[PDB]
Amino acid sequence: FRPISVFREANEDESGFTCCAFSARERFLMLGTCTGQLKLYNVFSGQEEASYNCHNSAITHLEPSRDGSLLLTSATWSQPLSALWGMKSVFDMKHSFTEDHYVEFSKHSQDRVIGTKGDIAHIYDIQTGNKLLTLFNPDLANNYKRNCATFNPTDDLVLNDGVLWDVRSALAIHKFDKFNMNISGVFHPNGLEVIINTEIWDLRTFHLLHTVPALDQCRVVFNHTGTVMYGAMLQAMKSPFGSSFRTFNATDYKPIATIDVKRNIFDLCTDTKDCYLAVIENQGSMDALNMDTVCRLYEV
Ligand SMILES: COc1ccc(C2(c3nc(NCCN)c4ccc(N5CCN(C)CC5)cc4n3)CC2)cc1
């Protein structure tokens, strides 16, 4: 991890970057701010190329569509809490997800959005903005405090609050038992396994395949080739994470590295070719009126 770029929010003495993702245009990073703006930076020169007022509160999350035409954003306490934005020609809101704190695109075909409202998953059509499904069963709920509903790689299944749902039938096919208070889980990009906090579960037998105590309270992200898994631990303008992330082999879940950048992390992502890792790193203290974040790009 060799840092090869670094920059802060132009003209802000308290740099307010909160989240980042690469755009479909390689040299250009998308970042959210603690005041609700979407910025586009040149990830090498640190030049601010563009700025949009998307929300009334800090952006917590953004996901561009692979084709470059759409962007999801989520916010902290503003209404709508999440939104879908067209980026062809003019930047503009297509749909708003009024009380979803988190949103994700479907994976195989990006024709759908899945949103989380506490313990409830909402699935929407991109083209209409209509809610196609509500996935919630109060008897099966685990009430995970950081629940983030997600689709599997083939879009036929949803993981919501540690419950596995068949999308076509809107049936709960399995509830994974609750073994932590916070982390709800992700699908492995291989589609054979789900990672719920420290437990790796088989998707056919629901067998426990690995116990990985190092993953406790970690938000997990794969690289685009699905060979490396990045974990950043939640800590118990307050960052969601601490000052370190860990990498694992996505195949056997062996630890590769533990990097302490010694600055609280707000977010991290990779380019689609997995050459770089962008990290939003806070300068100065937990106990500060504000944050002062920078974006650092590391060559992997
Ligand atoms: C599975 O565990 C999870 C799941 C989801 C999250 C969320 C998140 N993710 C972030 N970035 C990583 C994903 N984009 C955030 C970044 C900054 C930030 N705060 C908000 C308030 N404000 C005072 C300063 C900025 C809040 C964030 N919340 C809500 C999506 C965190 C941990």
GROMACS .gro file of C-alpha atoms and ligand atoms in nm:
model
  332
    1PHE     CA    1   0.000   0.000   0.000
    2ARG     CA    2   0.202   0.291  -0.149
    3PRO     CA    3   0.011   0.626  -0.135
    4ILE     CA    4   0.023   0.785  -0.488
    5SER     CA    5  -0.237   1.066  -0.445
    6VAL     CA    6  -0.389   1.269  -0.160
    7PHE     CA    7  -0.632   1.563  -0.154
    8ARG     CA    8  -0.889   1.745   0.058
    9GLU     CA    9  -1.218   1.922  -0.016
   10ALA     CA   10  -1.138   2.249  -0.203
   11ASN     CA   11  -1.182   2.574  -0.005
   12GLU     CA   12  -1.307   2.401   0.312
   13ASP     CA   13  -1.090   2.452   0.624
   14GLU     CA   14  -1.278   2.148   0.765
   15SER     CA   15  -1.260   1.906   0.470
   16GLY     CA   16  -1.594   1.723   0.471
   17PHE     CA   17  -1.551   1.411   0.252
   18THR     CA   18  -1.763   1.130   0.404
   19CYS     CA   19  -1.777   0.860   0.135
   20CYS     CA   20  -1.632   0.778  -0.208
   21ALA     CA   21  -1.667   0.554  -0.512
   22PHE     CA   22  -1.496   0.559  -0.849
   23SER     CA   23  -1.711   0.687  -1.135
   24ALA     CA   24  -1.731   0.494  -1.467
   25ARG     CA   25  -1.461   0.754  -1.578
   26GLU     CA   26  -1.137   0.605  -1.420
   27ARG     CA   27  -0.944   0.931  -1.329
   28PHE     CA   28  -1.259   1.066  -1.147
   29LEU     CA   29  -1.364   0.988  -0.790
   30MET     CA   30  -1.713   1.058  -0.657
   31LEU     CA   31  -1.729   1.175  -0.300
   32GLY     CA   32  -2.009   1.269  -0.061
   33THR     CA   33  -1.970   1.541   0.201
   34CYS     CA   34  -2.090   1.600   0.552
   35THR     CA   35  -2.303   1.893   0.415
   36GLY     CA   36  -2.482   1.675   0.156
   37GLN     CA   37  -2.288   1.760  -0.162
   38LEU     CA   38  -2.179   1.510  -0.426
   39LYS     CA   39  -1.837   1.605  -0.559
   40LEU     CA   40  -1.641   1.477  -0.857
   41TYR     CA   41  -1.264   1.501  -0.814
   42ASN     CA   42  -0.976   1.417  -1.037
   43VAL     CA   43  -0.832   1.145  -0.810
   44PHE     CA   44  -0.471   1.230  -0.919
   45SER     CA   45  -0.464   1.620  -0.929
   46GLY     CA   46  -0.721   1.665  -0.647
   47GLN     CA   47  -0.907   1.919  -0.866
   48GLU     CA   48  -1.283   1.952  -0.789
   49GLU     CA   49  -1.441   1.902  -1.136
   50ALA     CA   50  -1.809   1.920  -1.015
   51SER     CA   51  -2.045   1.972  -0.717
   52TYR     CA   52  -2.419   1.897  -0.670
   53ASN     CA   53  -2.646   1.967  -0.364
   54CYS     CA   54  -2.802   1.620  -0.322
   55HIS     CA   55  -2.908   1.608   0.046
   56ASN     CA   56  -2.964   1.833   0.354
   57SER     CA   57  -2.740   1.615   0.578
   58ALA     CA   58  -2.410   1.424   0.538
   59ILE     CA   59  -2.396   1.163   0.259
   60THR     CA   60  -2.321   0.823   0.420
   61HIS     CA   61  -2.307   0.612   0.101
   62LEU     CA   62  -2.291   0.629  -0.275
   63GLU     CA   63  -2.301   0.365  -0.554
   64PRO     CA   64  -2.272   0.447  -0.921
   65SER     CA   65  -2.423   0.202  -1.167
   66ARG     CA   66  -2.158   0.015  -1.378
   67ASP     CA   67  -2.290   0.177  -1.700
   68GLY     CA   68  -2.220   0.533  -1.571
   69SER     CA   69  -2.585   0.649  -1.610
   70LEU     CA   70  -2.711   0.622  -1.246
   71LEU     CA   71  -2.602   0.700  -0.888
   72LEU     CA   72  -2.750   0.598  -0.553
   73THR     CA   73  -2.685   0.818  -0.250
   74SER     CA   74  -2.789   0.790   0.117
   75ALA     CA   75  -2.791   1.060   0.389
   76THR     CA   76  -2.803   1.079   0.772
   77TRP     CA   77  -3.136   1.254   0.879
   78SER     CA   78  -3.257   1.444   0.563
   79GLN     CA   79  -3.581   1.355   0.367
   80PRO     CA   80  -3.560   1.178   0.128
   81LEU     CA   81  -3.297   0.972   0.317
   82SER     CA   82  -3.174   0.795  -0.007
   83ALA     CA   83  -3.215   0.881  -0.379
   84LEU     CA   84  -3.141   0.769  -0.736
   85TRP     CA   85  -2.984   1.027  -0.973
   86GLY     CA   86  -2.943   1.024  -1.352
   87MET     CA   87  -2.596   1.131  -1.476
   88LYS     CA   88  -2.658   1.126  -1.854
   89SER     CA   89  -2.639   1.487  -1.993
   90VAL     CA   90  -2.792   1.666  -1.685
   91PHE     CA   91  -2.743   1.555  -1.317
   92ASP     CA   92  -3.095   1.517  -1.168
   93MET     CA   93  -3.305   1.313  -0.923
   94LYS     CA   94  -3.500   1.023  -1.093
   95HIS     CA   95  -3.644   0.858  -0.774
   96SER     CA   96  -3.627   0.922  -0.399
   97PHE     CA   97  -3.643   0.646  -0.134
   98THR     CA   98  -3.811   0.846   0.140
   99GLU     CA   99  -3.707   0.646   0.456
  100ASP     CA  100  -3.438   0.404   0.330
  101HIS     CA  101  -3.107   0.485   0.518
  102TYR     CA  102  -2.919   0.253   0.277
  103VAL     CA  103  -2.964   0.154  -0.085
  104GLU     CA  104  -2.787  -0.080  -0.328
  105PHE     CA  105  -2.830  -0.177  -0.691
  106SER     CA  106  -2.911  -0.529  -0.797
  107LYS     CA  107  -2.589  -0.703  -0.913
  108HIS     CA  108  -2.632  -0.920  -1.225
  109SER     CA  109  -2.870  -0.683  -1.404
  110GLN     CA  110  -2.880  -0.331  -1.251
  111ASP     CA  111  -3.261  -0.285  -1.313
  112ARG     CA  112  -3.349  -0.275  -0.940
  113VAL     CA  113  -3.266  -0.098  -0.616
  114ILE     CA  114  -3.279  -0.256  -0.270
  115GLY     CA  115  -3.328  -0.023   0.027
  116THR     CA  116  -3.319  -0.077   0.403
  117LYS     CA  117  -3.551   0.083   0.653
  118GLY     CA  118  -3.438  -0.054   0.989
  119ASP     CA  119  -3.533  -0.425   0.981
  120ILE     CA  120  -3.734  -0.388   0.651
  121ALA     CA  121  -3.602  -0.442   0.293
  122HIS     CA  122  -3.774  -0.249   0.007
  123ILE     CA  123  -3.705  -0.349  -0.357
  124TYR     CA  124  -3.775  -0.096  -0.627
  125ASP     CA  125  -3.788  -0.087  -1.006
  126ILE     CA  126  -3.530   0.166  -1.139
  127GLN     CA  127  -3.737   0.261  -1.447
  128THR     CA  128  -4.069   0.328  -1.252
  129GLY     CA  129  -3.942   0.392  -0.895
  130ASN     CA  130  -4.228   0.165  -0.773
  131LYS     CA  131  -4.177  -0.054  -0.463
  132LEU     CA  132  -4.194  -0.415  -0.605
  133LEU     CA  133  -4.149  -0.590  -0.266
  134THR     CA  134  -4.138  -0.544   0.108
  135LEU     CA  135  -3.928  -0.814   0.287
  136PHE     CA  136  -3.991  -0.824   0.663
  137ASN     CA  137  -4.102  -1.106   0.897
  138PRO     CA  138  -4.121  -0.998   1.264
  139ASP     CA  139  -4.086  -1.363   1.394
  140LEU     CA  140  -3.763  -1.407   1.185
  141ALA     CA  141  -3.612  -1.056   1.252
  142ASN     CA  142  -3.271  -1.032   1.420
  143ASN     CA  143  -3.304  -0.648   1.464
  144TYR     CA  144  -2.940  -0.597   1.356
  145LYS     CA  145  -2.851  -0.231   1.438
  146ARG     CA  146  -2.652  -0.186   1.115
  147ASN     CA  147  -2.886  -0.401   0.895
  148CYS     CA  148  -2.812  -0.341   0.520
  149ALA     CA  149  -3.030  -0.553   0.288
  150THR     CA  150  -2.842  -0.680  -0.020
  151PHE     CA  151  -2.894  -0.889  -0.333
  152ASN     CA  152  -2.682  -1.197  -0.413
  153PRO     CA  153  -2.472  -1.203  -0.737
  154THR     CA  154  -2.759  -1.345  -0.946
  155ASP     CA  155  -3.035  -1.117  -0.795
  156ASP     CA  156  -3.262  -1.417  -0.708
  157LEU     CA  157  -3.196  -1.388  -0.328
  158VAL     CA  158  -3.190  -1.104  -0.072
  159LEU     CA  159  -3.014  -1.104   0.263
  160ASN     CA  160  -3.211  -0.881   0.506
  161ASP     CA  161  -3.152  -0.874   0.883
  162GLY     CA  162  -2.979  -1.217   0.859
  163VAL     CA  163  -3.280  -1.370   0.680
  164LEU     CA  164  -3.235  -1.520   0.334
  165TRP     CA  165  -3.528  -1.440   0.098
  166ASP     CA  166  -3.626  -1.581  -0.240
  167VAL     CA  167  -3.718  -1.271  -0.444
  168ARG     CA  168  -3.957  -1.440  -0.693
  169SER     CA  169  -4.182  -1.597  -0.421
  170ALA     CA  170  -4.099  -1.333  -0.147
  171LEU     CA  171  -4.048  -1.635   0.083
  172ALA     CA  172  -3.800  -1.652   0.376
  173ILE     CA  173  -3.599  -1.966   0.302
  174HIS     CA  174  -3.364  -1.945   0.605
  175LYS     CA  175  -3.292  -1.741   0.913
  176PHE     CA  176  -2.928  -1.731   1.024
  177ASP     CA  177  -2.913  -1.718   1.405
  178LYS     CA  178  -2.804  -1.393   1.572
  179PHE     CA  179  -2.442  -1.396   1.711
  180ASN     CA  180  -2.373  -1.018   1.723
  181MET     CA  181  -2.582  -0.700   1.774
  182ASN     CA  182  -2.480  -0.496   1.462
  183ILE     CA  183  -2.360  -0.668   1.143
  184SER     CA  184  -2.628  -0.823   0.918
  185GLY     CA  185  -2.392  -0.960   0.644
  186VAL     CA  186  -2.302  -0.977   0.273
  187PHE     CA  187  -2.292  -1.237  -0.006
  188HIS     CA  188  -1.957  -1.357  -0.129
  189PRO     CA  189  -1.927  -1.260  -0.497
  190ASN     CA  190  -1.881  -1.638  -0.566
  191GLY     CA  191  -2.250  -1.682  -0.472
  192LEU     CA  192  -2.182  -1.997  -0.258
  193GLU     CA  193  -2.143  -1.835   0.088
  194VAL     CA  194  -2.265  -1.549   0.310
  195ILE     CA  195  -2.042  -1.358   0.558
  196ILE     CA  196  -2.239  -1.254   0.871
  197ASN     CA  197  -1.991  -1.086   1.109
  198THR     CA  198  -1.756  -1.369   1.220
  199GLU     CA  199  -1.953  -1.656   1.060
  200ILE     CA  200  -1.915  -1.775   0.701
  201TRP     CA  201  -2.227  -1.983   0.614
  202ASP     CA  202  -2.279  -2.219   0.316
  203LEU     CA  203  -2.581  -2.109   0.109
  204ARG     CA  204  -2.694  -2.468   0.027
  205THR     CA  205  -2.653  -2.653   0.363
  206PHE     CA  206  -2.651  -2.336   0.593
  207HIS     CA  207  -2.347  -2.505   0.751
  208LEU     CA  208  -2.083  -2.296   0.926
  209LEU     CA  209  -1.776  -2.297   0.694
  210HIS     CA  210  -1.539  -2.058   0.877
  211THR     CA  211  -1.520  -1.873   1.210
  212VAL     CA  212  -1.317  -1.556   1.150
  213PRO     CA  213  -1.300  -1.368   1.479
  214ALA     CA  214  -1.083  -1.098   1.315
  215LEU     CA  215  -1.399  -0.991   1.115
  216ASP     CA  216  -1.593  -0.891   1.434
  217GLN     CA  217  -1.789  -0.561   1.383
  218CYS     CA  218  -1.631  -0.521   1.031
  219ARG     CA  219  -1.801  -0.373   0.721
  220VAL     CA  220  -1.672  -0.603   0.443
  221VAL     CA  221  -1.606  -0.504   0.074
  222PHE     CA  222  -1.453  -0.725  -0.201
  223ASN     CA  223  -1.231  -0.613  -0.482
  224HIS     CA  224  -1.381  -0.636  -0.832
  225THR     CA  225  -1.199  -0.970  -0.906
  226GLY     CA  226  -1.347  -1.116  -0.581
  227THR     CA  227  -0.998  -1.233  -0.465
  228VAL     CA  228  -0.956  -0.997  -0.165
  229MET     CA  229  -1.196  -0.897   0.110
  230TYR     CA  230  -1.143  -0.567   0.295
  231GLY     CA  231  -1.274  -0.530   0.654
  232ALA     CA  232  -1.296  -0.204   0.848
  233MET     CA  233  -1.406  -0.239   1.210
  234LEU     CA  234  -1.690  -0.015   1.334
  235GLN     CA  235  -1.585   0.182   1.639
  236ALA     CA  236  -1.805   0.120   1.949
  237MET     CA  237  -1.847   1.440   1.335
  238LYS     CA  238  -1.808   1.072   1.455
  239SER     CA  239  -1.654   0.826   1.203
  240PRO     CA  240  -1.833   0.495   1.154
  241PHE     CA  241  -1.495   0.304   1.150
  242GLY     CA  242  -1.160   0.308   1.340
  243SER     CA  243  -0.816   0.371   1.197
  244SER     CA  244  -0.745   0.024   1.049
  245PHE     CA  245  -0.860  -0.218   0.786
  246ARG     CA  246  -0.770  -0.578   0.731
  247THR     CA  247  -0.749  -0.781   0.407
  248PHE     CA  248  -0.830  -1.150   0.365
  249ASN     CA  249  -0.796  -1.402   0.084
  250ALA     CA  250  -1.160  -1.428  -0.044
  251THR     CA  251  -1.104  -1.806  -0.113
  252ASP     CA  252  -0.980  -1.936   0.229
  253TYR     CA  253  -1.036  -1.619   0.445
  254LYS     CA  254  -0.674  -1.618   0.559
  255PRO     CA  255  -0.550  -1.275   0.676
  256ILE     CA  256  -0.318  -1.100   0.426
  257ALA     CA  257  -0.256  -0.762   0.595
  258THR     CA  258  -0.371  -0.535   0.879
  259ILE     CA  259  -0.306  -0.164   0.793
  260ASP     CA  260  -0.340   0.105   1.060
  261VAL     CA  261  -0.343   0.441   0.873
  262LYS     CA  262  -0.366   0.594   1.231
  263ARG     CA  263  -0.654   0.825   1.117
  264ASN     CA  264  -1.023   0.721   1.143
  265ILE     CA  265  -1.158   0.581   0.817
  266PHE     CA  266  -1.493   0.704   0.674
  267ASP     CA  267  -1.484   0.488   0.359
  268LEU     CA  268  -1.269   0.296   0.117
  269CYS     CA  269  -1.320   0.157  -0.235
  270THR     CA  270  -1.128   0.014  -0.533
  271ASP     CA  271  -1.116   0.096  -0.902
  272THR     CA  272  -1.275  -0.171  -1.124
  273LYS     CA  273  -0.921  -0.295  -1.230
  274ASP     CA  274  -0.822  -0.334  -0.859
  275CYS     CA  275  -0.500  -0.124  -0.901
  276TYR     CA  276  -0.587   0.129  -0.629
  277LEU     CA  277  -0.759   0.170  -0.294
  278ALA     CA  278  -0.907   0.512  -0.212
  279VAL     CA  279  -0.948   0.580   0.164
  280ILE     CA  280  -1.122   0.872   0.333
  281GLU     CA  281  -0.908   0.939   0.642
  282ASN     CA  282  -0.995   1.193   0.912
  283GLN     CA  283  -0.724   1.434   1.036
  284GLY     CA  284  -0.780   1.537   1.397
  285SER     CA  285  -0.984   1.406   1.680
  286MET     CA  286  -1.300   1.211   1.755
  287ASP     CA  287  -1.376   1.495   2.011
  288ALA     CA  288  -1.396   1.773   1.748
  289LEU     CA  289  -1.695   1.993   1.647
  290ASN     CA  290  -1.596   1.885   1.291
  291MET     CA  291  -1.407   1.635   1.084
  292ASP     CA  292  -1.117   1.720   0.848
  293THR     CA  293  -1.095   1.430   0.603
  294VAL     CA  294  -0.859   1.364   0.315
  295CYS     CA  295  -0.876   1.116   0.032
  296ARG     CA  296  -0.560   0.908  -0.009
  297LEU     CA  297  -0.509   0.678  -0.306
  298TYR     CA  298  -0.283   0.378  -0.246
  299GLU     CA  299  -0.137   0.153  -0.514
  300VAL     CA  300  -0.213  -0.206  -0.410
  301LIG     C1  301  -2.231  -0.301   0.803
  301LIG     O1  302  -2.184  -0.185   0.876
  301LIG     C2  303  -2.219  -0.055   0.832
  301LIG     C3  304  -2.323  -0.039   0.740
  301LIG     C4  305  -2.359   0.087   0.692
  301LIG     C5  306  -2.292   0.200   0.739
  301LIG     C6  307  -2.335   0.336   0.682
  301LIG     C7  308  -2.226   0.444   0.670
  301LIG     N1  309  -2.123   0.425   0.584
  301LIG     C8  310  -2.027   0.521   0.564
  301LIG     N2  311  -1.929   0.490   0.473
  301LIG     C9  312  -1.899   0.351   0.430
  301LIG    C10  313  -2.004   0.303   0.327
  301LIG     N3  314  -2.033   0.412   0.233
  301LIG    C11  315  -2.039   0.642   0.638
  301LIG    C12  316  -1.951   0.752   0.631
  301LIG    C13  317  -1.974   0.865   0.711
  301LIG    C14  318  -2.083   0.876   0.801
  301LIG     N4  319  -2.104   0.992   0.882
  301LIG    C15  320  -2.247   1.016   0.914
  301LIG    C16  321  -2.271   1.129   1.016
  301LIG     N5  322  -2.172   1.241   1.013
  301LIG    C17  323  -2.170   1.299   1.149
  301LIG    C18  324  -2.035   1.212   0.965
  301LIG    C19  325  -2.039   1.118   0.842
  301LIG    C20  326  -2.173   0.767   0.810
  301LIG    C21  327  -2.148   0.654   0.731
  301LIG     N6  328  -2.237   0.556   0.742
  301LIG    C22  329  -2.485   0.384   0.690
  301LIG    C23  330  -2.429   0.327   0.558
  301LIG    C24  331  -2.189   0.189   0.831
  301LIG    C25  332  -2.154   0.061   0.877
   0.00000   0.00000   0.00000
